[PDB]
Amino acid sequence: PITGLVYDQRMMLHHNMWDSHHPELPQRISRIFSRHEELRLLSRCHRIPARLATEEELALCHSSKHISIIKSSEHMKPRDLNRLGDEYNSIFISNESYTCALLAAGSCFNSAQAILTGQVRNAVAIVRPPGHHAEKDTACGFCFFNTAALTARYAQSITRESLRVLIVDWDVHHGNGTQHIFEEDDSVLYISLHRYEDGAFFPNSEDANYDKVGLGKGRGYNVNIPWNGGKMGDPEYMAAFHHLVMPIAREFAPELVLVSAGFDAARGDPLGGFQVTPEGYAHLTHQLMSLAAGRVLIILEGGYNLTSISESMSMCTSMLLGDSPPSLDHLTPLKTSATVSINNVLRAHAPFWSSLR
Ligand SMILES: CN(C)c1ccc(C(=O)N(CC(=O)NCc2ccccc2)Cc2ccc(C(=O)NO)cc2)cc1
Ligand SMILES: [K+]
Ligand SMILES: [K+]
Ligand SMILES: [Zn+2]
């Protein structure tokens, strides 16, 4: 029962060459990694080597046009990199972005393979750039390829096509890319908790609302938990896990759990506006570990307070290693709008899940 860890400093090379103060800094992952060494979590883990995703593996979720357009950025001069990135919503590109995107996806492939072959029980992936905003045919919100979506498809390719994968997305933003990719799919259950503000928060789309339950055979397999008008924290996310995430997950019975683990909902994040504590993330991780015989892969998405994301993700790795979960409140009453949100999701998904009756 070992925990895997994958990290490669080459993923720092991707950067915003016109703004050295951009929040998607290279030091996001180096600070997370350095904290794992200071807390002596690194030497307790088994080091998974990073690798490059192949274009065939990328084609599991993305179109040939999108892959070839991102690949062509390798050769561009800065003036043309700037024009190309301006065609997207919140995207900056450099000459090494494609390679870094390949390394983030290939690293999680090796981690899922290590989990599904039994080499490790679970794993953590300290990777960048993130992926959950990336669509089949376009890049968006600092994401080029959908690392979590690709990993679920890669997981099915090395086991069986119908492998039931649960994607839990606790990044403060809606994973619009992951939802659309698996929207008609009933083998991948997508559960996202995200700040919504009636569609005013990025990515500013009503697709993130609670009534989007999936399409076709995927009806019931898309669970949006949208927060509105409130500084959500540990009590709200714990109650969402107790009423929605866990009863639906246990009925779905996943064989593999992927966590789009953004930490921009953590306390102190400069743009998330929430106050989830590192002990809160630790509790959420310990919960998910009770699923799928403990086969949990935690993939870094967003998070932009260097101290916050380093302490938060370190708490998650400590849970995967088997350390005792923190004791939290449980009796703290929720903000009223959070009870409204949880009740709205229960109402929209009760027809599809007998555990929600
Ligand atoms: C350079 N600096 C300091 C910022 C730049 C953009 C924002 C921002 O606001 N966005 C969201 C957004 O709404 N942009 C439109 C807009 C228009 C006018 C005013 C304000 C915003 C970008 C963003 C995208 C994805 C993720 C993510 O993947 N997180 O995990 C994070 C952030 C903040 C600071
Ligand atoms: K989310
Ligand atoms: K789905
Ligand atoms: Zn985010």
Side-chain angles (χ1 to χ4, degrees), residues 1-37 39-55 57-64 66-78 80-120 122-160 162-216 218-230 232-357:
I2 268 80
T3 297
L5 189 155
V6 57
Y7 167 85
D8 200 302
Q9 63 188 29
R10 280 174 301 168
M11 277 174 289
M12 302 171 68
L13 296 178
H14 169 70
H15 79 287
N16 191 332
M17 58 191 311
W18 310 277
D19 182 10
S20 71
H21 306 133
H22 192 278
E24 215 291 281
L25 282 166
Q27 9 285 136
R28 285 182 64 248
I29 57 172
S30 63
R31 286 279 303 262
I32 291 173
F33 182 75
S34 150
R35 190 73 183 129
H36 276 70
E37 311 181 271
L39 293 180
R40 289 143 57 160
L41 295 172
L42 180 65
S43 57
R44 300 173 62 192
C45 291
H46 174 263
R47 192 64 180 268
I48 310 291
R51 79 159 167 97
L52 304 157
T54 62
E55 291 178 6
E57 291 166 330
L58 290 187
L60 293 172
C61 300
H62 298 267
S63 69
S64 297
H66 175 63
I67 300 173
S68 66
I69 286 174
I70 303 301
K71 192 188 183 188
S72 77
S73 75
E74 281 193 283
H75 314 276
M76 295 184 179
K77 51 175 194 159
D80 295 329
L81 290 172
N82 187 78
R83 282 187 217 182
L84 178 61
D86 206 55
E87 289 186 4
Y88 300 104
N89 185 347
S90 308
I91 286 285
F92 61 85
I93 316 172
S94 61
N95 289 126
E96 53 275 335
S97 300
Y98 179 65
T99 295
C100 293
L102 290 181
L103 281 172
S107 307
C108 297
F109 295 168
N110 274 358
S111 299
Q113 186 184 50
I115 290 181
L116 293 165
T117 56
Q119 166 168 248
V120 307
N122 50 46
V124 63
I126 304 161
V127 296
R128 75 185 282 272
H132 71 155
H133 293 304
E135 313 265 34
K136 177 185 194 105
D137 194 56
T138 202
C140 177
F142 317 144
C143 306
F144 299 90
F145 312 119
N146 200 315
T147 300
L150 290 165
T151 306
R153 292 302 195 201
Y154 169 82
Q156 287 164 338
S157 75
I158 74 175
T159 55
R160 71 176 201 278
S162 64
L163 186 78
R164 302 189 302 280
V165 184
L166 163 66
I167 300 186
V168 173
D169 189 337
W170 70 43
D171 184 295
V172 82
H173 299 98
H174 179 238
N176 59 289
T178 308
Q179 163 167 313
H180 292 144
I181 285 172
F182 302 110
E183 203 163 31
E184 303 181 64
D185 193 319
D186 67 347
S187 66
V188 177
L189 170 64
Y190 181 60
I191 305 179
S192 170
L193 312 90
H194 47 271
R195 183 171 176 189
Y196 184 57
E197 316 286 20
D198 299 321
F201 201 64
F202 185 89
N204 316 89
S205 167
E206 294 193 328
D207 293 359
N209 211 358
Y210 58 87
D211 54 321
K212 312 298 184 288
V213 306
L215 299 179
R219 283 174 54 78
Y221 293 88
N222 193 94
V223 183
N224 287 332
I225 306 177
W227 305 121
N228 302 289
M232 304 316 183
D234 295 358
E236 289 71 28
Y237 278 73
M238 290 171 100
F241 266 58
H242 175 73
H243 291 288
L244 290 164
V245 182
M246 293 302 296
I248 285 179
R250 285 186 296 256
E251 190 170 356
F252 174 71
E255 288 126 314
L256 173 68
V257 178
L258 307 186
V259 187
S260 275
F263 301 101
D264 37 12
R267 138 170 54 74
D269 186 87
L271 50 84
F274 283 177
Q275 49 179 351
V276 183
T277 71
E279 288 77 27
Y281 289 110
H283 175 267
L284 300 187
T285 298
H286 188 76
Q287 286 281 278
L288 293 177
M289 289 177 59
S290 69
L291 306 166
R295 305 216 288 266
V296 182
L297 163 56
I298 289 178
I299 308 176
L300 176 74
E301 296 280 352
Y304 307 102
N305 183 303
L306 297 178
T307 305
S308 291
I309 68 175
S310 293
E311 216 77 38
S312 298
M313 197 166 212
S314 293
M315 286 287 284
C316 293
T317 305
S318 178
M319 295 299 103
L320 300 183
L321 288 174
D323 303 351
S324 301
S327 284
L328 291 193
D329 51 276
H330 290 280
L331 272 66
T332 292
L334 321 178
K335 296 183 165 49
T336 301
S337 78
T339 302
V340 175
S341 284
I342 296 178
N343 286 338
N344 277 331
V345 179
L346 282 170
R347 202 167 301 114
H349 279 283
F352 314 111
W353 300 101
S354 54
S355 66
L356 292 194
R357 261 38 127 96

